Design an enzyme around this catalytic site. Structure first.
Site: not given
Lengths: 34, 133, 457, 151, 81, 57
Positions: E37-38
């Site tokens: 997802l970062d």
């Protein structure tokens, strides 16, 4: 603790009224009569 | 129908106290040891006592002082009558209130004159010192 | 002479009292003698009351006398836990300072000769010095002693010579006759130095703005029993004397008032402004005190009767309220030893009733109706305003700042978060509440019957 | 501080003020997606020296648009009630003062409480030795892990 | 309020986020090493998640975050449940 | 006359009751709302005596 304060008020109210009653009543009796 | 009739019910609330007053007043009548007014004789004023008698200055000083306090009380009265006239008018005034306003004008004028810049430690010798001025 | 003997009589009673009972002795009898003092209050509506050849009791003195008699028990109640570890002989020695002191006050209020009045006026200096110097905390007190001292004497000494002079240029020095035999002194140059000679001492003892420096530095140092007197009374007595000697002077006062009216009218706003930013509370109160005394001193100098009425009232009211703030601050100082106001923080959270006293006390400090403080102040604003229509613009600023810092001392040392680690606080003794209730109740009853406090005019 | 977390906080911040403008959940959603789209569409990868300049741009561009007052949750330092309840949060040691006529009325709670206080006064020397142990002369880090008791 | 209510409402918000595939979601499921997802989306999931409660997240605590269990733990601390 | 002064003075009493134990009770405030209620009920009357005849005092 709320004990010490309420005690103080119990005392103070008790004395101011202790002498308080005889005086007030004395003033009233003096009012109605003499 | 008139709302004010409710006051008659309220009048009953007055009646209690009315009766109550008797219950006091009756006893109040039973014993009535009583006071009456005090008055002080006239004394000769400072103007005629000599420059060094202290007792003349003193008697006359107390007399002057009593007279002063009295005069203040009179101005108190005339002001109270002024307040009375003021409220008593519905909205008009500039009427009978002008009448009292006049006598108040004269009275306050002269009282202003007799007792103005005396300052603290007002003293009869000073009111004299002003009157000569 | 009846009230004054027992006041002497407590001393034998103190010394002969059992070693652990003395506080009760001195307390009880001091209260009794207060009640006896109260009968004096009657006065008369015309002539000043008289007694012996050597005493008299003007209406101006009586409320003050009642007060002065009233304070002793209070100082005892404050002191008697502040000290404990002290040796019995030393404690027994200690209350003697206090009572000896008030004895000098009861003597110096009833006067009558202004030389007797002077010698007692200056005699008061010793016991208060001893108290400031031996029982004050921290080092500075030593130095403080000196400031308290010379500023009085440097003022008082010329007054002394001046007094002697007059009783030579005229007949008696006695107050009554001089009230009657009074004759104007006027301009020249000798008469001006006479003026300052008969004013400067009185204007030192109640601090004037250019000269007040000793007063804060006294209050920072003195043990509280010294503080209550040094604030509530001595200032006020300097005012009493200055109200006395103004029976002479005139018309010259009209010409010499101005410089002191400038130091006062400006010094009030100024000192109040300094008052707005103190580091520590015990000083904050002191500057509040000067900031109010300036009002008294202009009230005396404009010499209008309203101004003397307001003078009397404000003297007494400020007496009680200032003493009240001092004991009320010492309580914190004992609970945490901080002195600095910032450390107290959220004191309200941890205990309530003291917050209530903070409220009442500060509340009457700012003076709001119908406190005798307020009514005392409003008159002198009235007479001042008569004296100069501009003057209001100054008085108003006072009534601004005296709000702020007053509320400030409340909101900074109370409302807000408790400090975390300060575990030292221990839930309010009975004597504390008793004490400040004793300050504040008379102050509130007293409003019902001003007519007995307004004084001679 | 470090660069990455920096640009991130700028992002959460700007995004929040952006809600404060857009009010409606709708418009806010749209411009939000547009915004993150700006952060990636721009230099989602780059050399640093350019990047800091990109921040210096972004800070200005934000500061101009930052809105006179953002929405703030009451617990937060703005707050409609940032400390409404600090009147109440009395520290525990204060109860330890009630005196027996009060202390009798909650036998249970006080019992458990002495249990705790005992636990602490017993414990403390261990945190002393451990703190003394894990610490070097004394670096930036605060606290240190438990290893066998208390922590 | 209760801990189950917290874990439930939290996942119940994580489920609705598109980038997460709902079946893969788990209370202990990791956030970067698992799921890509970062952070730029992490900020979204955290602010959007606190927003559900009206609760406020301090930034340095926002930096940790990651595991949903760590989150439910966090709200568990701040609400003192 | 008695009316207005009563429509003021009764308000004072609960504060007086503030030192009484009822103040410490949860029960207190409703006595206050009731107090202002009676105060209002009483308060209407002067307005009506003020109405049709218009007197002021």
């Amino acid at each position: 603790s709320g004990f010490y304060d309420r005690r103080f008020l119990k005392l103070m109210r008790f004395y101011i009224l202790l002498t308080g009653i005889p005086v007030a009543i004395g003033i009233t009796l003096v009012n109605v009569f003499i | 129908p008139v709302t004010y009739l409710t006051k008659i019910f309220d009048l009953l609330v007055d009646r209690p106290v009315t009766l109550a007053r008797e219950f006091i007043e009756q006893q109040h009548a039973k014993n009535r040891y009583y006071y009456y007014h005090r008055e002080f004789r006239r004394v000769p004023d400072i103007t005629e006592c000599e420059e060094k008698d202290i007792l003349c200055m003193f008697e006359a000083e107390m007399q002057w002082r009593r007279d002063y306090k009295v005069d203040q009380e009179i101005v108190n009265i005339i002001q109270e009558r002024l307040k009375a006239c003021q409220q008593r008018e519905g909205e008009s005034y500039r009427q009978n209130c002008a009448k009292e306003l006049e006598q108040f004008t004269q009275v306050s004028k002269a009282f202003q004159d007799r007792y103005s810049d005396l300052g603290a430690h007002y003293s009869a010798r000073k009111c004299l010192a002003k009157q000569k001025q | 002479l009846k009230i004054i003997i027992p006041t002497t009589m407590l001393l034998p009673m103190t010394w002969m009292s059992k070693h652990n009972m003395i506080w009760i002795n001195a307390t009880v009898h001091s209260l009794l003698i207060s009640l006896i003092s109260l009968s004096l209050l009657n006065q008369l509506g015309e002539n000043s009351l008289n007694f012996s050849l050597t005493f008299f009791s003007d209406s101006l003195s009586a409320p003050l006398l009642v007060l002065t008699t009233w304070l002793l028990p209070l100082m005892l109640m404050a002191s008697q836990s502040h000290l404990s570890k002290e040796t019995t002989t030393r404690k027994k020695l200690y209350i003697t300072m206090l009572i000896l002191l008030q004895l000098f006050l009861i003597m110096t209020f009833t006067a009558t000769e202004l030389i007797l009045f002077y010698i007692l006026f200056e005699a008061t200096l010793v016991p208060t010095l001893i108290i400031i110097t031996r029982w004050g905390n921290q080092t500075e007190r030593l130095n403080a002693g000196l400031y308290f001292l010379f500023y009085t004497l440097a003022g008082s000494l010329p007054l002394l010579v001046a007094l002697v002079y007059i009783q030579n240029t005229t007949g008696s020095l006695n107050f009554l006759i001089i009230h009657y035999w009074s004759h104007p002194l006027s301009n020249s140059w000798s008469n001006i130095f006479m003026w300052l000679a008969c004013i400067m001492a009185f204007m030192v003892k109640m601090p004037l703005y250019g000269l007040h420096l000793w007063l804060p530095k006294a209050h920072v140092e003195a043990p509280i029993a010294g503080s209550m007197v040094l604030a509530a009374v001595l200032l006020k007595l300097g005012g009493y004397g200055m109200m006395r000697i103004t029976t002479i002077l005139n018309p010259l006062t009209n010409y010499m008032a101005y410089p002191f009216l400038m130091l006062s009218m400006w010094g009030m706003i100024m000192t109040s402004s300094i008052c707005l930013r103190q580091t520590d509370l015990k000083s904050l109160i002191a500057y509040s005190s000067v900031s109010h005394m300036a009002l008294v001193i202009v009230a005396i100098m404009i010499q209008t009767p309203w101004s003397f009425m307001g003078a009397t009232a404000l003297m007494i009211a400020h007496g009680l309220t200032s003493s009240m703030l001092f004991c009320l601050a010492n309580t914190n100082y004992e609970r945490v030893h901080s002195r600095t106001m910032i450390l107290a923080r959220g004191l309200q959270t941890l205990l309530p009733l003291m917050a209530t006293w903070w409220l009442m006390a500060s509340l009457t400090n700012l003076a709001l109706p119908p406190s005798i403080n307020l009514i005392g102040e409003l008159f002198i604003i009235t007479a001042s305003f008569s004296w100069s229509n501009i003057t209001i613009i100054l008085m108003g600023m006072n009534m601004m700042i005296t709000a702020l810092y007053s509320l400030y001392m409340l909101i900074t040392t109370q409302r807000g978060k408790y400090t975390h680690h300060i575990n030292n606080i221990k839930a309010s003794f009975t004597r504390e509440n008793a004490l400040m209730a004793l300050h504040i109740l008379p102050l509130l009853l007293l409003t019902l019957n001003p007519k007995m406090i307004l004084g001679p005019l | 501080l470090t660069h990455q977390q920096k640009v991130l906080r700028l992002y959460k911040r700007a995004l929040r003020h952006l809600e404060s403008w857009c009010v409606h959940r709708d418009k806010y959603r749209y411009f939000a997606c547009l915004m993150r789209a700006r952060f990636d569409e721009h230099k989602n990868e780059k050399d640093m020296v350019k990047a800091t300049q990109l921040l210096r741009q972004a800070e200005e561009e934000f500061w101009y648009g930052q809105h006179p007052q953002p929405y703030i949750f009451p617990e937060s330092p703005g707050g409609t009630s940032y400390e409404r309840y600090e009147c109440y949060k009395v520290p525990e040691w204060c109860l330890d003062d009630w005196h027996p006529s009060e202390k009798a009325m909650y036998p249970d709670y006080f019992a458990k409480r002495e249990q705790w206080k005992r636990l602490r006064r017993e414990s403390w020397e261990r945190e002393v030795k451990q703190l003394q142990e894990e610490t070097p002369p004394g670096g930036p880090r605060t606290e240190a892990l438990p290893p066998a008791r208390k922590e | 309020l209760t801990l189950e209510a917290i874990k439930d409402r939290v996942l119940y918000v994580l489920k609705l986020y598109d980038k997460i595939d709902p079946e893969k979601l788990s209370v202990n499921s990791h956030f970067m090493k698992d799921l890509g997802l970062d952070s730029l989306d992490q900020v979204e999931i955290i602010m959007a998640m606190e927003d559900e409660f009206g609760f406020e997240i301090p930034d340095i605590d926002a930096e940790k975050l990651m595991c949903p269990q760590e989150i439910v733990d966090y709200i568990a601390d701040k609400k003192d449940v | 006359a008695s009316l207005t002064l009563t429509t003021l003075i009764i308000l004072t009493i609960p504060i007086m009751m503030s030192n009484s134990n009822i103040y410490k009770t949860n029960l207190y405030p409703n006595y206050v709302k009731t107090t202002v209620s009676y105060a209002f009920t009483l308060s209407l009357v002067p307005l009506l005596m003020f109405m049709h005849t218009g007197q002021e005092m």
